[PDB]
Design a binder for this molecule. Structure first.
Ligand SMILES: CCCCCCCC/C=C/CCCCCCCC(=O)OC[C@H](O)CO
Ligand SMILES: CCCCCCCC/C=C/CCCCCCCC(=O)OC[C@H](O)CO
Ligand SMILES: CCCCCCCC/C=C/CCCCCCCC(=O)OC[C@H](O)CO
Ligand SMILES: CCCCCCCC/C=C\CCCCCCCC(=O)OC[C@H](O)CO
Ligand SMILES: CCCCCCCC/C=C\CCCCCCCC(=O)OC[C@H](O)CO
Ligand SMILES: OC[C@H]1O[C@@H](O)[C@H](O)[C@@H](O)[C@@H]1O
Length: 487
């Protein structure tokens, strides 16, 4: 491990900020009266008569769901495009496109003068997210020394949570603007894109992609540079071995369903789905809706998005320290147990305080204990399914289908991000605390799934990952002998 490989992965992980900024900023902007009046005067015309509501709760009308989904549709579709680009031209090439498309969408939003620029900036933001999220995890996983691959991979997620936090702070400040606050909120999304774009000019590409697309001596020089050694023959042989197999495959989507890829295929699909049916993107807004409904500051709701975002970042550090010293399984099991227990605690706490005879017992101290319970649940997510949701699919895919496997990860995730968060929109807004129990069972299901089916992937060089599957009960019947590289 060199100072060069470290700085390279830090600079590449900054692509998480794009997704993170957008996740953090859109809740505040949508509550801004000046922004609603411009683009959705029908929402404003009933926010005017609500006072105790949250505006994004009325994005339940058919045309409003269209506008919301368009970003996830664009990202879902970009991510497949980026599978092809990333393999054909290299990982740093999809990262460039991700930033540049995100930049273009940011200025379109910040300078929108009607609802068609907003759509167009929203389509573009999602293209940015499909490319950034499809290729940055691949880049990190392949560039990092195997010893610390998980730590340097999670920096992508660390960046996502920094994006979430920073956006929430921005919204808090621009919300106290006489005019154009929403333009600042959307417009500052352009700083991370410029950073990502400029960065992509300076990053090297992975020797894995370099060797796979013909640049041989260039691949070994880059391996010797990031590893800092001259005797890279050993792991360069793993690369030679894998490119030998991978260069027999063109159109990885043709062979994706072959038996030797079944483990990676299953997990590239279930891990994104599970990450969302956790309910993280429903539960993260229970407290601000609740706070606003029951009186309490408009500020108070935004203040609790900051507190959660401070907890959501920072918790990330736990996964970063633990993931390579003790593994992925530990974080998956502990994180799920913790998340399971907070969901039962908060579901029943609400169900008690506001349910015996009648309904309606507003309380400050009761509101803070629900936020503490959610924060511990968000912490358990933040060092399990959060980061592990962008680490594990990237590190279980043989070279020829790695980019395609990351695209399955992004597309399934965006599809379910939108689907779960829109389906649960009504219950979240009408304070149906039964959702915490439902999300409890899913966390139970997914924790059991993980326990039995996911082998430990820590410490293994990326191209040797088939030995791990072969040494797992159950999955071992899928992996042919010729798929085990380096031992
Ligand atoms: C109020 C304005 C504030 C503006 C805020 C600007 C945000 C800066 C971006 C940071 C990307 C962070 C991602 C880097 C994650 C690095 C952690 C890591 O990857 O691990 C290191 C490894 O363990 C070593 O041994
Ligand atoms: C490395 C740094 C890169 C720099 C990244 C750029 C920063 C983006 C900020 C954008 C804010 C846009 C503010 C525009 C607000 C003026 C809008 C206006 O005045 O128009 C009113 C409208 O027409 C009424 O109908
Ligand atoms: C080596 C790695 C170091 C590990 C670093 C880990 C840092 C994670 C911190 C988590 C805080 C979770 C506790 C949740 C805080 C509750 C906040 C709250 O309840 O807010 C109420 C507020 O007062 C209403 O107004
Ligand atoms: C080019 C690389 C891949 C690009 C992938 C593109 C695929 C997604 C396309 C459209 C998403 C849906 C867009 C439809 C948006 C309609 C918005 C709207 O109708 O807003 C109404 C407003 O509320 C007034 O009432
Ligand atoms: C990985 C190491 C294993 C560690 C396992 C930890 C699991 C914790 C489970 C439930 C905590 C629920 C209790 C949350 C404590 C919140 C304290 C708090 O601050 O709430 C007080 C409130 O702010 C005043 O009104
Ligand atoms: O930190 C919170 C975020 O973590 C990411 O890993 C997930 O993909 C996001 O949906 C989530 O909102």
């Amino acid at each position: 491990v060199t100072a060069f490989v470290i700085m390279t992965c830090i600079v590449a992980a900054m692509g998480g900020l794009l997704f993170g900024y957008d996740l953090g900023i859109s809740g505040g902007v949508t509550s801004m009266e000046e922004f609603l009046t411009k683009f959705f005067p029908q929402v404003e015309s009933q926010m005017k008569k609500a006072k105790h509501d949250t505006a994004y709760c009325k994005f339940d009308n058919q045309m409003l769901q269209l506008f919301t989904s368009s970003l996830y549709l664009a990202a879902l579709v970009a991510s497949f495009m980026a599978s092809v680009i990333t393999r054909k031209h290299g990982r740093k090439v999809s990262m460039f496109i991700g930033g540049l498309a995100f930049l273009i969408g940011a200025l379109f939003n910040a300078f929108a003068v009607n609802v068609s620029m907003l759509i167009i900036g929203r389509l573009l933001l999602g293209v940015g997210v499909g490319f950034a999220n499809q290729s940055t995890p691949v880049y990190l996983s392949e560039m990092a020394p195997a010893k610390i691959r998980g730590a340097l991979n999670i920096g992508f997620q660390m960046a996502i949570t920094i994006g979430i936090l920073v956006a929430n702070l921005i919204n808090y400040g621009t919300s106290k603007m006489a005019q154009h606050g929403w333009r600042v909120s959307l417009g500052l999304a352009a700083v991370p894109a410029v950073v990502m774009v400029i960065g992509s000019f300076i990053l090297p590409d992975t020797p894995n992609s370099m060797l796979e697309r013909g640049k041989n001596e260039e691949a070994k020089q880059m391996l010797k540079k990031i590893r800092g050694a001259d005797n890279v023959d050993h792991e360069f042989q793993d690369l030679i071995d894998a490119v030998e197999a991978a260069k027999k495959v063109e159109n990885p989507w043709k062979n994706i369903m072959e038996s030797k890829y079944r483990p990676a295929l299953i997990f590239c699909s279930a891990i994104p789905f599970f990450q969302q049916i956790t309910g993280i993107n429903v539960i993260m807004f229970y407290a601000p809706v609740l706070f606003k409904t029951l009186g309490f500051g408009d500020d108070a709701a935004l203040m609790s998005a900051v507190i959660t975002g401070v907890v959501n970042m920072l918790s990330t550090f736990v996964s970063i320290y633990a993931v390579d010293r003790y593994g992925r399984r530990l974080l998956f099991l502990e994180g799920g147990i913790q998340m399971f227990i907070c969901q039962l605690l908060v579901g029943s706490f609400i169900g008690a305080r506001f349910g015996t005879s009648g309904t309606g017992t507003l309380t400050p101290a009761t509101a803070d204990w629900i936020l503490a319970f959610i924060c511990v649940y968000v912490a358990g997510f933040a060092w399990s399914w959060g980061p592990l949701g962008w680490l594990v699919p990237s590190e279980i895919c043989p070279l020829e289908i790695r980019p395609a496997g990351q695209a399955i990860n992004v597309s399934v995730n965006m599809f379910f991000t939108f689907l779960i968060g829109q389906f649960f929109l009504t219950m979240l807004c009408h304070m149906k605390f039964g959702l915490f129990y439902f999300f409890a069972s899913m966390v139970a299901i997914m924790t059991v799934f993980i326990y039995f089916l996911l082998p430990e992937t820590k410490g293994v060089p990326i191209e040797e990952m088939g030995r791990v599957w072969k040494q797992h009960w159950f999955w071992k019947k899928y992996i042919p002998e010729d798929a085990i590289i380096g031992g």
